[PDB]
Amino acid sequence: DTVEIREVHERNNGRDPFPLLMNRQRMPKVLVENAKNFPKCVLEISDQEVLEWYTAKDFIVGKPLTILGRTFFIYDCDPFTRQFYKDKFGMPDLPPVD
């Protein structure tokens, strides 16, 4: 149940070629109210500070997804993901958004 975010580099985009925006890690969706004072500089976020983790249900084509204060708009998914959502969640075809 880990998330990794990769940057897509175009030719002549003027950016340093770094393949990753975010390392593969488990992503907290909702933190406990007391976790505002959690010493993130010394401790990793444990299951005790997280009220809700990101699940496969939270990634939906055509919806905004907020990770680490950045709002991503999911516009398409691969054929395997499309089949997996149909089989696991009974969701109708996830049309690509232009």
Partner 1 sequence: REIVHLQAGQCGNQIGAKFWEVISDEHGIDPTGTYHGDSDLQLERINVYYNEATGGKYVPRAVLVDLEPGTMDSVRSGPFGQIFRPDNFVFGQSGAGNNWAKGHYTEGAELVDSVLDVVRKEAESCDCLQGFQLTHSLGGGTGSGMGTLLISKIREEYPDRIMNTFSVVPSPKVSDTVVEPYNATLSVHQLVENTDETYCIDNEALYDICFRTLKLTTPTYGDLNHLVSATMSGVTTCLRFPGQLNADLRKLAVNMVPFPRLHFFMPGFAPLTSRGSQQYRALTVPELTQQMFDAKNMMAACDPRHGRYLTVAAVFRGRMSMKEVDEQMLNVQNKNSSYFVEWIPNNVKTAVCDIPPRGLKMSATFIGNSTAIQELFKRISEQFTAMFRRKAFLHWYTGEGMDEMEFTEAESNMNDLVSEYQQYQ
| 14 forms part of the interface with partner 1 (CB under 8 A) | yes
Distance of CA 94 to the CA centre of its chain: 17
**Gyration radius of the chain over CA positions:** 16
Report the residue number, 40 or 70, with the smaller CB distance to partner 1. Answer: 70
Contact predicate 58/64, CB 8 Å:
no
Determine, following the binding rule CB under 8 A, whether residue 16 of this chain makes contact with partner 1. yes
Contact 77, 97 (CB under 8 A): no
In this chain, which of 1, 8, 10, 12 binds partner 1, going by CB under 8 A?
12
Using CB under 8 A as the binding rule, whether residue 37 contacts partner 1 is answered as no
Minimal distance, residue 75 CB to partner 1, in Å: 24
- The single-letter code of the amino acid at 60 is I
State which of residues 15, 71, 80, 87 lies at the interface with partner 1 (CB under 8 A). 15
